Design a protein around this ligand. Structure first.
Ligand SMILES: [Cl-]
Ligand SMILES: [Pr+3]
Ligand SMILES: [Pr+3]
Lengths: 144, 152
């Protein structure tokens, strides 16, 4: 049904696309579509225009960066499947940049708190053990 | 071997311990030294921490479900781990254990949340700006025969 069926398979294709990019039903017809998608997206990695066009853009930035770039990709009123896929590609690039920066920043912030507590509360005690080597002098378990 | 060596070594062990319990990201810090000494301690934390999985007292201490931003959570919990004024290696390792479970928890929500909100923008734009054209092709099956390179 070329009315609603489009979006159900779009949401499905997109999610499968993103998920793949991040690693580096899904029935019969769907499988074969996903495959071509993967092929087109893989080809896009070598598309120097696309690559330039994304490069000219400061990521981990608001929806205003997305909707503007998405717009320039279709300024000329023309459409094709390569252009549609390149939209997905962009969305994936944005997800991947986010992960690449927001995730290590998450990890760093929490490492921050831990080491903060460790200094203000444990540094002293650890000194008395002879340092971190007291750790191998330990085969017990905490109880509270 | 105190004062400054404690913090440098402390951070290295923390990093490696967390990266261990995760599924690799480039933290852009100093790489974990691959020497005898720190490979020893690292393998010590793992043994101690492997036990902590079955330590339900700690699992209770640590337990919460998106009740709050991990921040004041972390400090209240970490203080509570040391409220009775007693120290030993088990609560030091357990502090490291907690840190990684909190990272994992945060990831398990931040990350999907991120992919969902970005998918909505794409699925928006596809509905606003591309849906009709796709109809005019008879759906996505046209994609199976596309072998071009888009231009702009
Ligand atoms: Cl080919
Ligand atoms: Pr502080
Ligand atoms: Pr809209």
């Amino acid at each position: 049904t070329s009315s609603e069926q489009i979006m159900k398979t779009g949401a499905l294709l997109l999610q499968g696309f993103i998920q793949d990019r991040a690693g580096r039903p899904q029935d019969a017809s769907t499988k074969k579509l996903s495959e071509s998608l993967k092929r087109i997206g893989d080809e896009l990695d070598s598309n120097m225009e696309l690559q330039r066009m994304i490069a000219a853009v400061d990521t981990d930035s608001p929806r205003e960066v997305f909707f503007r770039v998405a717009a320039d990709m279709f300024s000329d009123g023309n459409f094709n499947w390569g252009r549609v896929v390149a939209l997905f590609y962009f969305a994936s690039k944005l997800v991947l940049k986010a992960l690449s920066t927001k995730v290590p920043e998450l990890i760093r912030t929490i490492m921050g708190w831990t080491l903060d507590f460790l200094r203000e509360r444990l540094l002293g005690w650890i000194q008395d053990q002879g340092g971190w080597d007291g750790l191998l002098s330990y085969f017990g378990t905490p109880t509270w």
